[PDB]
Amino acid sequence: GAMAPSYRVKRMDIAKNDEECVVNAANPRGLPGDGVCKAVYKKWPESFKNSATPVGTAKTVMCGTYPVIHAVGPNFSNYTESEGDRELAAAYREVAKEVTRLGVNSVAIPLLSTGVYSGGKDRLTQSLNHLFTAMDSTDADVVIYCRDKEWEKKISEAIQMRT
């Protein structure tokens, strides 16, 4: 575990993380993907061997000895708000179990279902609160990776407001 388990947020490419493992905001088919998706694939392509896993689950594949945790958040384009919310909470619970099983002291994580899978809605608070529900009981240092300065500010404020 980390000596003083913390949350931090960084506004940068998760492919350049400084943590002991990475959560890929995965598709269920283990497909390399397109756009910002390809970043994780480009950095750790070996981790996409047999990475396919259902919505609401997480599957870890090693790239060398570096764990890539494929976490499949729901695509809110396909799910009702209610069922998408359930699967989003479940995907993070499976991430907490994987991070624990791996025995890492740190994990880089994105806000699942807030990008291409957001169904065009702002899910910062929804996704972050499910992340906290799952990871609060883990002792890894959690570093949340985002794209936009405003999201960095809002994630930072939500973290600091509990400390």
Using rule CB under 5 A, residue 115 touches Cl ion: yes
Of residues 32 and 115, the one with the C-beta less far from Cl ion: 115
* Closest CA relative to residue 25, chosen from 9, 6, 41: 41
Nearer to Cl ion, 20 or 27 (CB): 27
> Residue 32 interacts with Cl ion (CB under 5 A)?
no
Chain positions 57 to 96 lying near Cl ion, rule: CB under 5 A, are none
- Using the contact rule CB under 5 A, the part of the chain among 22-30, 51-59, 100-108, 154-162 near Cl ion is 22-30
Specify whether the backbone of 77 is left (phi greater than 0), alpha (psi in -120 to 50) or beta.
Answer: alpha
Indicate the residue among 6 and 80 with the shorter CB distance to Cl ion.
80
Distance CA 84, CA 90 (A): 10
Q: Are 141 and 121 in contact (CB under 8 A)?
A: no
**Residue 119 binding Cl ion, by CB under 5 A:** no
**Nearest distance, CB of residue 106 and Cl ion, angstroms:** 22
Neighbours of 16 (CB within 10 A): 11
Q: Residue with structure tokens 């910002």? A: 36
* Residues belonging to the chain: 163
- 151 binding Cl ion? (CB under 5 A): no
Binding part of the chain for Cl ion, among 2-10, 94-102, 112-120, 139-147 by CB under 5 A, reads 112-120
Angstrom distances, CA of residue 51 to CA of 30, 109, 155: 5, 17, 29
Q: How far apart are CB 2 and Cl ion at their closest, in Å?
A: 27
CB 132 within 8 A of CB 161: no
Question: Does residue 5 interact with Cl ion by CB under 5 A?
Answer: no
Q: Binding segment for Cl ion among 78-86, 109-117, 128-136, 137-145 (CB under 5 A)? A: 109-117
Binding site for Cl ion (CB under 5 A): 25, 115-117
